[PDB]
Amino acid sequence: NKLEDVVIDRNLLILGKILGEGEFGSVMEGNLKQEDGTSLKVAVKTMSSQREIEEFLSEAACMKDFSHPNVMRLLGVCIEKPMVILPFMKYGDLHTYLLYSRLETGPKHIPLQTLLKFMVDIALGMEYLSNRNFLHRDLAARNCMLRDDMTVCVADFGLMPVKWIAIESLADRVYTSKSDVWAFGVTMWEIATRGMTPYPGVQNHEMYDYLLHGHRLKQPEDCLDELYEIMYSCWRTDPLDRPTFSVLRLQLEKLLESLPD
Numbered sequence: 425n426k427l428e429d430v431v432i433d434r435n436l437l438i439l440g441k442i443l444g445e446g447e448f449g450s451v452m453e454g455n456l457k458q459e460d461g462t463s464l465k466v467a468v469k470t471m472s473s474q475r476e477i478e479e480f481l482s483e484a485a486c487m488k489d490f491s492h493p494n495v496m497r498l499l500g501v502c503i504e505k506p507m508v509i510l511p512f513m514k515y516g517d518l519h520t521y522l523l524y525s526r527l528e529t530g531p532k533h534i535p536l537q538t539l540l541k542f543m544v545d546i547a548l549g550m551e552y553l554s555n556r557n558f559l560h561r562d563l564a565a566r567n568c569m570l571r572d573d574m575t576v577c578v579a580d581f582g583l584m585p586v587k588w589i590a591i592e593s594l595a596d597r598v599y600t601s602k603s604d605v606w607a608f609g610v611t612m613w614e615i616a617t618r619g620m621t622p623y624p625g626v627q628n629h630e631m632y633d634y635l636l637h638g639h640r641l642k643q644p645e646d647c648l649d650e651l652y653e654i655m656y657s658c659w660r661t662d663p664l665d666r667p668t669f670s671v672l673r674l675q676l677e678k679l680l681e682s683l684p685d
């Protein structure tokens with residue numbers, strides 16, 4: 425109905441350079457002019473009936489009413505394939521941030537307190553979205569962004585990463601919150617391994633069988649048994665046995681409490 429406020433005129437937007445090309449869309453830098461007269465740096469992510477366009481912009485309306493420190497906000501949508509206008513993060517994605525942390529010019533040895541704080545951030549975000557019954561469908565360290573206060577916020581939620589998908593989705597083609605829990609365990613594995621590609625030595629087409637024989641992601645070298653238990657709880661065969669994002673968040677929070685400053 426009156427939810428046309430999600431639509432923003434193209435005249436208020438000024439596109440720039442390509443910061444990254446995918447296959448389902450591209451991400452460009454841009455400036456957004458506002459009612460205040462000031463302009464902000466924004467990322468514009470590009471992308472057949474009038475019933476699916478409505479669903480895209482309505483779901484977009486829900487995302488526009490979301491407001492959580494660890495969840496990205498939806499600034500708007502232009503219609504010139506559609507274009508999704510979100511805030512701009514100078515520090516970039518956590519995956520590249522960790523891989524850079526392993527290099528000398530980048531960050532220093534990121535301690536387990538900072539890694540765990542990242543995981544707690546993503547846990548609070550995904551839990552916030554779970555309480556509102558919103559599904560991410562694409563959760564990875566590449567899709568988690570770092571903010572100006574060095575906090576991680578979830579992104580790319582709404583409407584291959586096979587190694588991030590759960591068995592029930594690989595087989596029954598059903599996607600629930602527990603599949604997002606699986607993706608959260610894989611993301612924790614990434615943050616602990618600081619950017620290692622999941623399931624080394626196993627190609628993308630062998631995933632299901634590999635998981636159908638009970639083989640999950642192995643424990644990293646420096647990882648702790650508590651962290652690997654938290655990850656392993658997410659990769660269980662039956663979603664009912666998997667923990668919820670609230671329980672996971674509290675677990676990681678207490679584990680971070682027990683560590684020296």
Ligand SMILES: N#Cc1cccc(-n2cc(-c3n[nH]c4cc(Cl)c(N[C@@H]5CCNC5)cc34)cn2)c1
Pocket residue numbers: 443444451466467469496510511512513514515516517566567569579580581
């Ligand atoms: N050179 C370079 C360089 C340097 C610093 C930062 C960036 N940079 C920022 C963004 C970005 N700002 N706000 C976003 C919102 C979403 Cl939703 C997404 N989604 C992505 C699609 C899949 N992976 C995430 C990205 C952004 C993307 N690049 C580039």
